[PDB]
From a paper:
Aldo-keto reductases (AKRs) are a superfamily of oxidoreductases capable of reducing carbonyl to primary and secondary alcohols, found in all phyla. In this work, we identify the enzyme AKRtyl, which is responsible for tylosin reduction. Phylogenetic analysis indicates that AKRtyl is the founding member of subfamily D within family 12 in the AKR superfamily. Specifically, by combining steady-state and transient kinetics, X-ray crystallography and molecular dynamics simulation, we demonstrate that AKRtyl exhibits a positive synergy mediated by an unusual Monod-Wyman-Changeux (MWC) paradigm of allosteric regulation at low concentrations of the cofactor NADPH, but an inhibitory effect at high concentrations is observed.
To obtain the apo structure of AKRtyl, we remove the carried cofactors by denaturation and refolding. We successfully obtained two apo structures of AKRtyl without any cofactor. The first apo structure is similar to our previous second purified-state structure, with two octamers in an asymmetric unit and one active (R4) and one dormant (T4) tetramer per octamer (R4T4). Unlike the classical MWC model where different conformational equilibria occur in the actual oligomeric state, AKRtyl is actually octameric, but we observe symmetric T and R conformational equilibria within the tetramer. We therefore propose that the basic unit of MWC-type allosteric ensemble is a tetramer rather than an octamer for: (1) The tetramer exhibits ligand-independent T and R conformations, suggesting that the equilibrium between the T and R conformations occurs within the tetramer.
Residue numbers in the entry:
A (entry chain D): 1 to 228, 247 to 331
B (entry chain H): 1 to 230, 240 to 331
C (entry chain A): 1 to 20, 28 to 50, 59 to 89, 96 to 231, 248 to 331
D (entry chain G): 1 to 21, 28 to 51, 58, 60 to 86, 96 to 231, 244 to 331
E (entry chain B): 1 to 230, 244 to 331
F (entry chain E): 1 to 22, 28 to 50, 59 to 86, 95 to 230, 246 to 331
Write the structure that this text describes.
């Protein structure tokens, strides 16, 4: 397993982030404990979860499945860099009670409390904003986070679904008064959706943020998903699959291996449903995509490159 | 129910703010609870109380009623933006013991823990200064609030009855060292009394404060007092000059099919920078009359007619100079 | 002549501010100097060229006076108000006319809510560093504009406003709400503009030897000052000199009697009795919030 | 003529920006733009355009005093944004403009090799000598605007006041992060190439009466020209009127070289596109909205 | 009973600060409680003490007598501004074990918890430095005090026996990083010893500190010394100062201990003196001296018998 | 000639400071010899006393380049005190009398309790950045004035005061209380004015052929002790100061090559433990506050 610094900070993480999305809704508590044990022994120390994981009326179940994983002992909690999220509605799906979503100091305080409880731990290592909230200013947001830091309840703060200028505003506001700003951005990034390259990824590079990609198979589309509706992308997908057949490669492992070559990308979040899915993703980290394959991938999946070159000059 | 951000911050608050002066004094515990449950049903999520509410030897009784209300479970605490106040003398009425009123770090420490205890909750959402205190400098005041914030005892800090320059000084002072400044001002603002427009409301609008209007009926003087003539407003109607003012107001509203109470709240909702009035329902029926006042549309003829009965100074320096 | 520090700063000034054809202002300025009045204020260019013709007569004139002037406007874009663009041209045309290489107190004519304080202070600091300006003052501001302005300046070490020039007299006391308390908190001198309320306080009912509720105000005023032997224009000036935070009033005498009239007013000491009487004819609003709530 | 504040600052500009492309013709239009009330002058749609301005000022009549004058900044350090290239750039520019100060001194493009403490040193020196009042950007990313004004404000300096970006109906990707960042920081937004190089200027009816060889683009402009053929509007005016409806857009750069092109842009400033027309224009030329919703959620 | 803002801050205190150094050593616990109820009853809320008061093997005792006074209930703790101190050795007298005196953050941490436990209360209102420590820098000091502040264990920080430049340096350091600085200086200042007027009181006044004057009778020297003859100062320079003091006050029919207290109350910048009653009669004597009015004629006399130096540099150049 | 850094800063000055005399020609000759003895620190403790240095600089010979030039700032309002108005007018008048485009050490004459430090530092910062002055000093400050001034300068990044010129001699030592301790804390040089107390230390009684009630007795013990030791009164008054912690050195105003030569002999004279013990006996100090008046 390959390691790297989470951007600029002293945290050392695995280049695969174990996504726990399915633990609860699609994969059961027992086998999820098995999948997390497999990850640990394969060298993966960076686990990503979210309060809202569990879904519907079980929003929260994933944070409990990790909580009961830690409760078995074995230095499991001590070994894991535990990240979870705040922003999402923890009420019944739909228009939330005011202040029970977004990033007010109010929702941050009540969300961290609920998440620490389900997780059976006194601290989160990486507490990420699940989305930008344009109505909450950064002096408020950093007040909330800093309180959780001073009480030892969180260590680092990360972002997800931010614009590049949010990363800059956040970390300049925090640096002004002596606070560690964002250390990571969790952005949507894969071969089919590459527009985080325009501003999101260069911003995070300028300010020293880790970059972790979610939907790294783009909802499974890059996962060999023709094998038994718009024709254009169907064709993009068909040629991606033909190209990999000529080269003897699995579509799943290339989507992941390809993110692992992009500049500034710490690693994708892999969401395995079985252990064979974890295993398969671990081999993607040993895969070395040639310059022949990389070149012909960028032909089928063109990127925009940075702004303002993307759209102007 | 209309929602709005409370000034610049991430807090979303209903544009009606449930005041709680009456709970204890004029409404007993049981009915107070029933009205609060009704506010949540009507979407009001923003509750305003104060330590001194409760009167005389019974000051703090209002907070205890919200506390027993929270104790029934049901996400009552988790659902409401809880706001209360510090400044007031909680001793027997009259000249307070030194440091038992106003905004020293001493009074702030003692007031907050007694409020938290009476409210039976581990945090206040909006901790408001009840009045400007000119003897306490802002590095002391922000020291006191910042301790409360870092301990998780309070979230947001508001002012009530401040001057314009007090809001500015407070929030520049906070900003220098990275503190969230005041998030809201609670000013006396209604039709008959519009001098908050001179400097208070412009300052709060510059510094990104919500504006919460208290005494929105002017002591009931706008709630149809003269037709109910079939404390402040009592001997204020014994002004010949002034009782024609409230006369033209009640005559106008009769022509237009409108209720004097509801138009006082609805008007405040048209003023620029006003988050919403504080309503003081003593029954669920008067709550329900306030909720209708938040959905009324005040047409341009009415507002024209209102502004000429109730003249406003507008902002300084233009209000006394040019 | 009574002198005072201009608010918090080290600048000492007389408590009359000498305000506002050519040669009959030159003689009145020289005797204002003889009276000990060093605070000269241009409160549009002939007056500045006229003060400019004064300094060019040698003899310690630019070295003895505190020189104050204002920005222009009350138009073409950026030719009024307080942008860096107008500040720059306003000051450079003011230095031309005044015939001097620096202005002592450079004032804003009025509040410009569309121009941010980081812009304004940049433009003043360029002038302070080039020796073109020493001190900045405000005119017709709200109390919260003073706070915001001096707080903004102090963040980066600049000296903020040292003075606010507002409308303030017995007929109009509404600067006591917030303007003057802000000025007092931040240590600005308060300069009373129109101390006689356009001469309304200077004995106007009598000069009819030549609104019904507002002339009864002035009637009770003069009738009061008849029975106490006092001169009306002088009391209006002496009444401002007793208000806390007031540095002094702008006066522009052109005779030698009005100069002596104004000097007497700055020496006149009003008995407590008359102060009480004037208070009931011309009530004051108090500072906010107490003025309109509690 | 509609005026407005240039972002957060107290400078008032007309919503038409007078940009560029012999001197007599230039002078007359500049005199006529001033007659129409245009005060915002810029030397870009950076040689000879500057001296045509310097000799226009040389005619007196308060010309210099009436315009907000904006200009902008390969052997090493003869391009890009080192303090070295800025120092030589502005002095050359000052001499060619025949004036002792530029009102709005803009970067031509972001320089990712130059840090902002060096850029703001160089800008601040010029500020304190009085050579320069305001600073603005061209062709930045959203995240360069934030990094810039954040670094300026740490020490009291005025940040960027404007950003000149490629914005028109056909190319709307500045809406993702560029324009969002400038509204947050209070920068005027100056839309460069508001017709997309004439592509929006009735280019198909002028082909009878370069990007046109692509059928997908060709149909897009055909729908555009048909819609205004039914609505009574001139296409070159719509393209500017549309931009004037976008939040944070100060105005477009217009380069009229004749009175007839001038009355055409003034008229553009005064149109009111109906909600029907805006709705149709948005189905023809869709925008991406802001990040991250543009590509995630 | 007159009240005043403590310097520039919001805290209101009595112009008499109740000295407690006699509570325990000389006056007993039961009678120290009675003196303290009478001080409440007389309007005094400013109680001053120190961890050391008690002396010798009994250092800490005074703090305990306030604790058991607070444990009587009756809103005694809630009515009182509690001031204690840190600097003095709390262990066996003499050379202190290293860091068991002075103002390292290590000594600060251990002194506040031991004073909190003796005082029977979770917070001190005014934590004072008992003396300047030139060896501890102010980033160290304000760190330790700020920790106490943010834990809610202390409200205000004050000094005692500083120079003027120590006050300046501390309050400027605290302000850089937003912290409320010194709120009070407790200096030695009476008729015999006026040299605090040179720099201590001007600096204190510049920075908005209350000035609390300790040893206001100069160890009894101003407490009717010779008439009571029925420190040493058998030096004849001081007994003429003091003879002409007592005979002037007997020409005018006045109490020596009362004038010493009434005098300090007229000095500009002085919040008030610390009065140290041993009995409740001595408490009522001090209360009287606080509504005493000394004529502008007597003050001339005292000033030519106890000449002040005034402010530096004027005090020794021009 | 012994040198020393002026307090905390990189300026290296001679331990003797050439003070103000009172003839152009005769002042010029002292100054040229002062240069030859290695004294580089010139101060003007203003009218003719400044234009004489100016005629001196105009002779050339690297006289301005070798010299660290120091100078200072009822009256008409704002024609004394330290208002920004008066500083800009004083420095203009000084720069022109002095026939030079910069002052090295611009010093305040006296504390002014009515001008704030953000006003003063505004004025001094203007001159620094125009190259008109380099270093700021103070004279006749209290200790807390030094502390306040330099804390205010450091907030927004200015060099603070670099030196304090205080009254400090054997007879008057109350600057050891707070002013010299403050200057020592903030890294200022301490420049001693009136090192002989108006001449009282350079042999007042052995030249009788101001001050004489109580003070005569101690001046006799002084002169007697120095007779019995073979030391000169003036030279010792100056040499004593050079042993005092934080003291850069004393202002000397020699009006004759001899006096300059005597001042120089004072700077390399080494007082013994016994003389030092005896002088403190005759002229006690109060030590630092608070110990001086408390404990």
């Amino acid at each position: 397993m390959e390691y790297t610094q989470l951007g600029r900070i002293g945290l050392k993480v695995s280049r695969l982030v174990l996504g726990t999305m399915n633990f609860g809704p699609t994969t059961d508590e027992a086998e999820s404990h098995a999948i997390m044990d497999a990850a640990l022994d394969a060298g993966i120390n960076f686990f990503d979860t979210a309060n809202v994981y569990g879904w519907g009326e079980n929003k929260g179940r994933t944070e409990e499945i990790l909580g009961s994983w830690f409760a078995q002992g074995g230095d499991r909690r001590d070994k894991v860099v535990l990240a979870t999220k705040v922003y999402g509605n923890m009420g019944l799906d739909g228009p939330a009670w005011p202040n029970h979503d977004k990033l007010s100091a109010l929702n941050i305080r009540r969300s961290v409390d609920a998440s620490l409880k389900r997780l059976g731990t006194d601290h989160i290592d990486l507490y990420q904003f699940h989305h930008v909230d344009r109505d909450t200013p950064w002096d408020e947001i950093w007040q909330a986070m800093d309180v959780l830091v001073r009480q030892g309840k969180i260590l680092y703060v990360g972002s997800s679904n931010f614009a590049g200028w949010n990363i800059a505003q956040a970390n300049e506001t925090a640096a002004r008064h002596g606070r560690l700003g964002l250390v990571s951005e969790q952005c949507l990034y894969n071969l089919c959706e590459r527009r985080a390259e325009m501003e999101v990824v260069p911003a995070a590079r300028e300010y020293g943020l880790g970059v972790i990609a979610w939907s790294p198979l783009h909802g499974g589309l890059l996962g060999g998903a023709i094998r038994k509706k718009d024709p254009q992308q169907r064709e993009q997908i068909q040629r991606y699959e033909d190209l990999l057949d000529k080269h003897g490669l699995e579509p799943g492992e290339v989507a992941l291996a390809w993110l692992l070559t992009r500049p500034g990308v710490t690693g994708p979040i892999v969401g395995p449903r079985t252990a064979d899915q974890l295993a398969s993703a671990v081999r993607a980290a040993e895969l070395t995509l040639t310059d022949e394959v990389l070149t012909a991938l960028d032909e089928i999946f063109p990127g925009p490159g940075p702004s303002p070159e993307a759209f102007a000059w």
